[PDB]
């Protein structure tokens, strides 16, 4: 299930960690939208450990599985918001940074369905499950 | 040099993102190695800001020119020890994390240069600057 | 949910897709194992259409929302049998074919699993799902 | 020349196969398009044992050197017709469908050349080249 | 056929490129292995002239339409010597220098088929190629 | 620092290869572009013999600290003109030749800041450069 356990290491590590889950915690930003850009980012990833959890955290924040099995396959499907296809986009987008570049006219898109704060928000939610991916992956963790 | 003023927008993400920097800096973790790993991270991910700031500071570090213009084909130089070329490695493939599966035996590798509480640590270093970019990127930042 | 009735354009066309279909109800194969390799192939293809229907029909054939959102993430998980997971590495290499090469002991590995008549089986399963997809995806096919 | 007999193993999976030859075969859609087609796709698979028949069948069908050589770099000639350019779109772009998302208005430009009964026969011969070329590849066929 | 007549327009540019092929035909490396390097890398690049004129340069060294047929998919063939199949290989590799390292005993590969002489010829063909590619894709030039 | 002396080997190929570099020489093109060219395709290509050489080289051609550490992610930098990110377009297009088609308006683009002649010698020199870093790779040839 691990094959090095990373928190015990370093516990700083795990505090700061935390930290954004705080902050995220914290902010105004919808929990099931942060739930599928959290589910979202692992699939991409490639991190069963935190698909996992998130599907499972994803169900407790009301989730169907309708929205939770279309999810992978988002852009061909009526399932998702105006608002949420901008998040996932700009998830994926940023998911993906390794690459290329980012298209020109992204944030003049996302701003059309999120005010300047809750971008800050989205993209800690984005910065926040691509470190936890990190993690989950290099520290060879599994699922149940 | 910036389109959205993401830490005046979130304090608590801003808060929340110094506070990885905050357990790095506690970290055993030598500085130059760090900065190897952030500058190289943002060169994969294309975060201007961020390669301009960290080859600044690596500069601030000690480094030499020889090594900063040879860290993006760190592979075939010599100029890198055994133990930054595993930190490399780690850093080049989970920078790429989106892109397809981590080798199995990587971590196992790693182990071979640094113990376990050095790869939280290393690990920690290469998600937070993954985090950086995803910021610097998003919001369009730009150096100088 | 469809920019072309193509069932209808040729009748002749849908028919032999039927077609195989029919062979594949007659095959040994078990049919669980059919629906991971559709819904595996419908995901890395990108046909919400298939992705639901599959979904759907895994769960006829009894399958847990366990296993249906760790499929996408499948190697990295204890969910999935020594017989599954050489399925799915023969699914994921066909489904990417036109991405390089076949690795040589593929096909090798697989006979330790599987008859060579369900390997011919199981080939027709990959095959018709990428046919499926293509129609799927090309007519601009939509779920719910 | 192959390392499994698949055919003879299921005998059901090759006469669905079969089954779409036969329904191409009854179809509007012009033999030597089907053949370009057929050709196109098998060289984008790297299927040697299809490119093998499908050359030998294009010249079979009339084809000039010219075409055939020119085929694999197509966009850059002008050696296509519009209505062959707009198949080739299509069958590259279906090729290549584990790779992204379909263009949005590339159904509408096919549209433009073909009527839709030509358009399901188009999308059924890149279906049944994309099935027998993972049969050719999988089980490790070799032309002459 | 050409967007700009670029031997006019630098007389120099050209006797330079001329003077690749002056060295080329000088080389011991025998003809028809370089017009099958020449042929592979323009399909590789999508130069359709170069395409074009070696698929034709390669008939009049003796070339079988065979062979011709079967280039771009090489590997899957019995076609090919071991001697050209190490050149091919080089020759693959080398066209895609961005995307990557080349392997680690791929020169150790090609010195069980050529002497070291060779090897530099062949690298002189592989790289002068790529060199009139960049010119015919650039300058927009069209066969025929 | 080598695998195989190429020059001594081969020495009508480096004649040849220096015959580039007296056409470029002698071209109108400032040497200040035709270096951050050199460089910038060495990073892609991943010569690091080559990265070495042109950095330095174009240190004494006059160049900043913060133009070198800039280059590898210059698209979202201020430091490089109209006429150098045309220039650096090209370079980066030329230089991925093998990974798709051209765009359709690039040489168009380019004519805005350059005549048909520094066209010529530009692309002259993404060739030359194209060609050295295939030696420098191929041939195994690491810095200082």
């Keep these: 299930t691990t094959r090095l356990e990373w928190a015990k290491a370093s516990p700083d590590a795990y505090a700061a960690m935390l930290g954004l ?14 739930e599928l ?3 979202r980012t692992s699939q991409i990833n490639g991190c069963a450990y935190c698909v ?3 599907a499972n955290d994803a169900r407790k924040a009301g989730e169907t ?3 939770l099995q279309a999810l992978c396959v988002w852009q061909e499907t ?23 570049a980012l298209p020109h006219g992204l944030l003049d898109e996302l701003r059309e369905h999120f005010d300047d704060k809750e971008i ?4 800690l939610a984005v910065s926040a ?3 936890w991916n ?3 992956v290099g520290m060879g963790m599994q699922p149940e």
Tied chains: 1, 2, 3, 4, 5, 6.
Excluded: C, D
């Design 21 to 34: 889950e705080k902050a995220l915690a914290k902010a105004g930003l919808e929990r099931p939208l942060i």
């Design 37 to 39: 850009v959290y589910l």
């Design 52 to 54: 996992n959890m998130h």
């Design 65 to 67: 599985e309708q929205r």
């Design 78 to 100: 009526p399932y998702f918001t105006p608002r949420e296809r901008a998040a996932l986009a700009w998830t994926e987008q940023l998911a993906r940074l390794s690459q290329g």
């Design 120 to 123: 800050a928000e989205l993209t």
């Design 129 to 131: 499950i691509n470190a």
């Design 134 to 136: 990190r993690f989950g």
